């Protein structure tokens, strides 16, 4: 399992969107299921586990692949 996808639709203010991998299609994502949600940016690559949703397809255990590691904490 676990596919690599690109972040295409994303509303960071609210915390939801749609990420499309190269194997399947767009899945319904939500900030709650992301371990590193502040790293979620457009055109960035993420990896997630496949699952199903009421409104379509969805993913769990979403981790973004950042090209750098900078601290973000008050």
Domain parsing of the chain, residue ranges:
1-74
Provide the CA 27 distance to its chain's centre, in angstroms: 9
Q: Which residue has the tokens 């601290």?
A: 71
Q: Domain 1-74 - what CATH class?
A: mainly beta
Give the technique used to solve this structure: NMR
Among 48, 24, 51, 26, residue whose Cα is nearest residue 37? 48
Tokens standing for residue 61: 């255990």
Contact 52, 32 (CB under 8 A): no
Q: Which of these, 43, 44, 50, lies nearest to 29 by C-alpha position?
A: 50
């Amino acid at each position: 399992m676990a596919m690599n996808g690109t972040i295409t639709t994303w509303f960071k203010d609210k915390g939801f969107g749609f990420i499309k991998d190269e194997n399947g299609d767009n899945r319904y994502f939500h900030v709650i299921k992301v371990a590193n949600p502040d790293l979620i940016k457009k055109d960035a690559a993420v990896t997630f586990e496949p699952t199903t949703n009421n409104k379509g397809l969805s993913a769990y255990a979403v981790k973004v692949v950042p090209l750098e590691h900078h601290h973000h904490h008050h």
